[PDB]
Amino acid sequence: PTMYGEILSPNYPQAYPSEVEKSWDIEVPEGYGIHLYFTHLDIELSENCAYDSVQIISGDTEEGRLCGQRSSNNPHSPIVEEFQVPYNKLQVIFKSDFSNEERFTGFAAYYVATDINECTDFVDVPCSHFCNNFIGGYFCSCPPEYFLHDDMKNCGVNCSGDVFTALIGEIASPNYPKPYPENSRCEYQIRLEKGFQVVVTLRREDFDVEAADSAGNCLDSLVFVAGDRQFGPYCGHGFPGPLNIETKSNALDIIFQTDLTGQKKGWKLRYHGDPM
C-alpha cells in the first residue's frame, strides 16, 4: 500500500539461504500501474530457470521468471531487466533450491506506481466523445452543446432547440450511439457569418436508419436544407451520399423524421467552415 518500494533478496548483498520461498505482495492505490525494475541480478543459472528463480506474477498470470548472472551494461543506467504493468497489485515469489554451485548475491529491485492514462493506455475508451485523464482517474467531456448522461460516460444532444454559432462543431442523433427515439422531428440550425460557407462531413459507417419501402420511399428520413438547395432525403444502413459535402451557404437546417417503430443505431456528423 505504497507509491514506491524496495525488494531485496534475504541477507543482501551476501549469499542467500537455500531451500527458500519468499513472497511479496505489492499494492498501490486505485488507478495506478506499476513499473518494476531490477538494479542487480546474480542468481544461480539454470535452464528455464529451474534450480533457482525469481518469479513475477500479476494476479493469476506469471509476468516473468528470471535467473542468471547479469549486470548493467550502460554506465548511464543501472537497469538490467524491467517490466511495466497496468495493474494496481503484484506478487513476487523468489525460490531457491537446496544447493548453490557458487556464491550468488541474489537480486536488488524496486517498484514505483505510475498513473494510468485511461484514454490512451486502454483499448476500450470509457467516453463517447472526449476523454480527460488525471493522476489517479479520468472523466469525460463532450463537444459544444452536448450534455452528459447520468451514467457519466456517454454524451447526448438535444433533438431540437439549440443555435450553433461555432465554425467547427459536432452534431449527433439523440442517445447516440444508443438507438434513436421514435416519433420525433428534430431540427438543428447552424448559423455562420455571411462571408463563410458551411461544409459538412460525416462518416459513411456512422449512419444506420430504418430502410425504405419497396418503392424507394424513406419511412424514416434525414434531410439537409440550405436555403433553396437540398440534400436528401437519406435513409438505410450506411450513408449513401459523399463523405465531404459543400453546401455553399452560411445557414443550414438539418431535419430528422422518425415513425413509431423501425429504429436503428443512428448517425453522427461534424461540420467546419470554408470562406467565400
Binding site: 507509491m3 514506491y4 524496495e6 548483498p13 551476501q14 549469499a15 538494479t39 542487480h40 543501472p78 548453490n100 557458487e102 556464491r103 548475491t105 536488488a108 524496486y110 514505483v112 506506481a113 505510475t114 498513473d115 472526449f130 480527460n132 485523464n133 488525471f134 493522476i135 489517479g136 467531456s141 459544444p144 454559432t165 461555432a166 465554425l167 467547427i168 457569418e193 467546419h272 467552415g273 470562406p275
Partner: protein, 291 residues
C-alpha cells in the same frame, strides 16, 4: 477559475463563458500546482477576435520565466495563430495565463459575437533524475551519486551494491563490515577494484568454511596499497587473522605470498587512510580437505 495550491487538475474559462466576452478587458490568471509538478494544458474551444500578429485580442500564456505563446482567433479559420488543441507544458509549478481584448470586436462595420475559450489543465510529475545538472548545485543537492528514482511528487535515492545511504539520503558510504564468505572457493577483492579504494574504512572480510577443511589463499596482480619503505603500512593496512590470530599485516606493490592456513576460519581486516591513490588487491580462496 481554479487557482489553488493543492489541486491536481482544473478548468480555466474566458470571462462570461459561454456568453461572449466583453470589450476592454484584460485578466491574468496563474495556475499553481504543488511542489515538484509540471502544468499541462490544452484548449477545447477557442474563439477570439482575429488579427495578423494578434494586435486586437489575444491570450498570452507564459511559463516559469518565458512567454511560450500569444495566440488569437478561431479554432479552424486560417486567420492565423490558433492553438486549437496543442499541448503547453511548463517547467516549474506555475503557469501564467492572460486574456486581453481591446475596445473594438466588430470588424467591418457589422456586429460580431465571439465566445471565448475552454482551457483544461492537468498536473504532471517531473523527472528529477533526468535534469542532470552535474555541476552547479551547492545551495541544494538535488542529484545523487549512484542512482536516484523518479516517482510521483518526490524522489528518493539509493546506492550501489555494498554501500549504505547516509542521513542526507543524497550520498553514500561503504558498509564493508559483515562481508561473509562460506562457499568452497571464491574471490575477494577490495571495493571498486582495480579502481582506487575508498578511504577511512574498517573492513572485516570473514571467511567461515565447514569444519574439516584447510584454506588456500592466492593473491592476484595487481596488488597496490599505499606503503612506505621506512615503516611498513603507515597509511593503509591489510591485516590477516587466521584461526583467531594475526598472520601478517600487508601493503605495498608486489603481491604477498600464497598462504596455506590449516584453518577453517579466517578474517581479512582492511584499514584505509583518508586518501586513495593506490589501486587495491584481489585474491582467490580455495578449500582442501584433511583426514
Amino acid at each position: 477559475s481554479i487557482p489553488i495550491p493543492q489541486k491536481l487538475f482544473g478548468e480555466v474559462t474566458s470571462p462570461l463563458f459561454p456568453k461572449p466576452y466583453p470589450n476592454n478587458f484584460e485578466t491574468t490568471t496563474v495556475i499553481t500546482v504543488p511542489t515538484g509538478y509540471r502544468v499541462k494544458l490544452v484548449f477545447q474551444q477557442f474563439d477570439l477576435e482575429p488579427s495578423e500578429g494578434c494586435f486586437y485580442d489575444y491570450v498570452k500564456i507564459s511559463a516559469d520565466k518565458k512567454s511560450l505563446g500569444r495566440f488569437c482567433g478561431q479554432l479552424g479559420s486560417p486567420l492565423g495563430n490558433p492553438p486549437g488543441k496543442k499541448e503547453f507544458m511548463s517547467q516549474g509549478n506555475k503557469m501564467l495565463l492572460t486574456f486581453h481584448t481591446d475596445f473594438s470586436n466588430e470588424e467591418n462595420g457589422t456586429i460580431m459575437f465571439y465566445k471565448g475559450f475552454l482551457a483544461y489543465y492537468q498536473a504532471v510529475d517531473l523527472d528529477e533524475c533526468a535534469s542532470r545538472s552535474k555541476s552547479g548545485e551547492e545551495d541544494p543537492q538535488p542529484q545523487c551519486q549512484h542512482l536516484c528514482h523518479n516517482y510521483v511528487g518526490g524522489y528518493f535515492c539509493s546506492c550501489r551494491p555494498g554501500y549504505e545511504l547516509q542521513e542526507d539520503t543524497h550520498s553514500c558510504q561503504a558498509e564493508c563490515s559483515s562481508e561473509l564468505y562460506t562457499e568452497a572457493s571464491g574471490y575477494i577483492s577490495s571495493l571498486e577494484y582495480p579502481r582506487s579504494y575508498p578511504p577511512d574504512l574498517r573492513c572485516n572480510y570473514s571467511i567461515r568454511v565447514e569444519r574439516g577443511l584447510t584454506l588456500h589463499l592466492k593473491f592476484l596482480e595487481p596488488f597496490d596499497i599505499d606503503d612506505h619503505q621506512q615503516v611498513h603500512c603507515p597509511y593503509d593496512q591489510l591485516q590477516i587473522y587466521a584461526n583467531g590470530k594475526n598472520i601478517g599485516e600487508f601493503c605495498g606493490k608486489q603481491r604477498p605470498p600464497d598462504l596455506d592456513t590449516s584453518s577453517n576460519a579466517v578474517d581479512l581486516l582492511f584499514f584505509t587512510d583518508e586518501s586513495g591513490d593506490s589501486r587495491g588487491w584481489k585474491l582467490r580462496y580455495t578449500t582442501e580437505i584433511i583426514k
